[PDB]
């Protein structure tokens, strides 16, 4: 337990704790504004992917073995999140683009004229 308490744990166990002077004046404003921007960036991505309010969010995007070809049993019970982040860092934007596309298609189907009303 604790902030980053699970940093050395395997991903599986770690997933169970996700619930955890004008010169000076300009520096303070920059710090406050930046903190707000970071907050909004994460919430906006969760919203656009359909994960608003969820610590765990499943999606309709399949896992592509090209990003990683490992078995779940050698990921979740074996490697830490720091290692995982490095392993698939190169596909981060690909995944995000796919998640956005899937969510937008889901919404278009939701309000299509056929079989709605």
């Amino acid at each position: 337990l604790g902030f980053l308490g699970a940093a050395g744990s395997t991903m599986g166990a770690a997933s169970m704790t996700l619930t955890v002077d004008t010169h000076w004046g300009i520096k303070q404003l920059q710090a406050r504004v930046l903190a707000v921007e970071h907050y909004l960036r994460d919430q906006q991505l969760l919203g656009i992917w359909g994960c608003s309010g969820k610590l765990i969010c499943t999606t309709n995007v399949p896992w592509n073995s090209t990003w990683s070809n490992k078995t779940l049993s050698e990921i979740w019970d074996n490697m830490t999140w720091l290692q995982w982040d490095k392993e698939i860092s190169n596909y981060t934007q690909i995944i995000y683009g796919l998640l956005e596309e899937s969510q937008n298609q889901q919404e278009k189907n939701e309000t299509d004229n056929l079989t709605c009303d």
Binding site: L4, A7, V20, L46, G50, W63, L82, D85, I95, L99
Partner: protein, 433 residues
């Protein structure tokens, strides 16, 4: 087919990062670091976590340096300018107290504008020789040594610059990782890494050669350097036991207030009464001898089967060839040649006093320290030495810029950005009603 992308938020990962830290807790340090200190910081050990640290590339050091320069200059803005004193000075020998010569000082007279801008008055002041430069050969005409390059600002007599402990704290979204390995040298991997939000309190001490009033090593004496076999790098020796040192100026300088103009005034040394000796400083002899021998014992692990010896600084001005420190607002320049002289009850180190101080490497700025009356004594501990290198291996009490004084306290801290959002495969597809 049967694996799906799942988004996880609150994932315990981070990236190396550079951000702006804020400083948490009359005087300057106390009004600038106005943010309250966390009364009960929660240090969290990250089990089965290792991380890479590098004290020589640590931006916390660089940021502290910039904050200090800024505070110093901001603090001195609303103060008296001494530009009007750049007038030629007519100087004699100075004979304070008895019928003798006060070496190190001169009695200078000068023509200064009265509050009315038309008339002038003749005033006297005593100055240290180190702040006064002779205008020509065999002349009695002198000038303040820094009127050639910049304005000299008188420090406000009401403002103390005495170091107080301060804490650097990360902003939301950031955390500071701390190395708790008792023998870690400052670079490379560190096991037993913990997370904190604020650093321990440190003091913005600005001494050179000998570090004063810092923390002590948890383990044995640690010699920290970048590429230690490189003669171009500075060696920081971090002691595990302190050495007590006391510096005194056993006399009373009177204060003369010389009006400059429209609410402006200069504080001059009036007269000096007391024991006229060169601000002597006492360091325990047996403590020093044993301490230095212990340093050599460890230094020999990097330089084996060599005769390690010590010499006084080889050169530069009296900002680096000496031990400069500012304890009571009185700026001392002590001779350490009595310490760094070896072939591996106290040692008296003579000291000089300067009143015009060019701090750091600002060059274009200078401060005048108002005289301090009364008889001043300062007590401090030596908590680390700064050495430079180059069958005899010679070390000298040389040094770098003032960043090195803080590298010695911030060597165990790193700033990282927290990145809570990430993805991984699982085997559960979104239900979609």
């Amino acid at each position: 087919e049967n694996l799906w992308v799942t988004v996880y938020y609150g994932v315990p990962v981070w990236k190396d990062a550079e951000t702006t830290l804020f400083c948490a807790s009359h005087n300057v340090w106390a009004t600038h670091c106005c943010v309250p200190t966390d009364p009960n910081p929660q240090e969290i050990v990250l089990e089965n976590v290792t991380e890479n640290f590098n004290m020589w590339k640590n931006n916390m050091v660089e940021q502290m340096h910039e904050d200090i320069i800024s505070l110093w200059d901001q603090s001195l803005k609303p103060c008296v300018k001494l530009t009007p004193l750049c007038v030629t000075l007519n100087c004699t020998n100075a004979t304070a107290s008895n019928s003798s010569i006060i070496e190190g000082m001169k009695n200078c007279s000068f023509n200064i504008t009265t509050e009315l801008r038309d008339k002038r008055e003749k005033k006297n002041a005593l100055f240290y020789k180190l702040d006064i430069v002779q205008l020509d050969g065999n002349s009695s005409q002198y000038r303040l040594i820094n009127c050639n390059t910049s304005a000299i600002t008188q420090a406000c007599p009401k403002v103390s610059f005495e170091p107080i402990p301060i804490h650097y704290c990360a902003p939301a979204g950031f955390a500071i990782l701390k190395c708790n390995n008792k023998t870690f040298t400052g670079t490379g991997p560190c096991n037993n890494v913990s997370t904190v939000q604020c650093t321990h309190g440190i003091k913005p001490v600005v001494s050179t050669q000998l570090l004063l009033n810092g923390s002590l090593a948890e383990g044995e004496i640690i010699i920290r350097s970048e590429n230690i076999t490189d003669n171009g790098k500075t060696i920081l020796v971090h002691l595990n036991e302190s050495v007590k040192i006391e510096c005194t100026r056993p006399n009373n300088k009177t204060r003369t207030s010389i009006r400059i103009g429209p609410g402006q005034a200069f504080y001059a040394t009036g007269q000096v009464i007391g024991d006229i000796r060169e601000a002597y400083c006492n360091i325990s002899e047996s403590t020093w001898n044993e301490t230095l021998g212990k340093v050599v014992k460890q230094l020999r692990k990097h330089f084996p089967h060599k005769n390690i010896t010590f010499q006084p600084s080889s050169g530069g001005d009296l900002e680096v060839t000496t031990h400069s420190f500012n304890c009571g607002g009185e700026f001392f320049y002590c001779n350490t040649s009595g310490l760094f002289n070896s072939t591996w009850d106290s040692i008296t180190l003579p000291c000089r006093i300067k009143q015009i101080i060019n701090m750091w490497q600002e060059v274009g700025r200078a401060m005048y320290a108002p005289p301090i009356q009364g008889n001043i004594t300062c007590v401090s501990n030596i908590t680390g030495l700064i050495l430079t290198r180059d069958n005899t291996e010679t070390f000298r009490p040389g040094g770098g810029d003032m960043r090195d004084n803080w590298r010695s306290e911030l060597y165990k801290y790193k700033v990282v950005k927290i990145e809570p959002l990430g993805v991984a495969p699982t085997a559960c597809k979104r239900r979609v009603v």
